[PDB]
Copies of this chain bind each other. A is one copy, B any other.
C-alpha cells in the first residue's frame, strides 16, 4: 500500500513559501521538476529541489507573482519511459 493526498491547484500569497512532494511508485530512475516555462528547475537560493530517495521535494521560497503557472513532476524508469504529474500554482496579492 502507498497512500497519497494530492491537490489540483494551490494558491500562494506573495512572500509566502511552500514545498511540494512528488512521488514515483515503480522503479523510477529519475524525478525532475519543470517550471511553468518548460525548464527543468535547478536549485537556487530561493527555489530548491532536494531528492529524498524515491521522492523529490520542490520548495518555493518567498513566492512572487511570477512563480504562477503549471509545474510538472516527471519520472523516468531505466528504459527511458516517462510519466508525470502536474500541479497548478496561483499567486495572489
Chain B nearest CB, measured from A78 CB (Å): 11
Alpha-carbon gap, A34 to B23, bound state (A): 23
**Identical chains bound together, number:** 2
A82 closest partner in B (C-beta): B1
Would you call the interface of chain A mostly helix, strand, loop, or mixed?
strand
Q: Identify A22's interface contact among B5, B31, B81, CB under 8 A.
A: B5
A-B contact pairs, 12 of them (CB 8 A): A1-B25, A1-B26, A1-B75, A2-B24, A3-B25, A4-B25, A4-B85, A5-B22, A6-B23, A7-B19, A7-B20, A11-B11
What is the interface of chain A, defined by CB distance below 8 A to chain B? 1-8, 10-11, 18-26, 28, 31, 71, 73-75, 77, 81-87
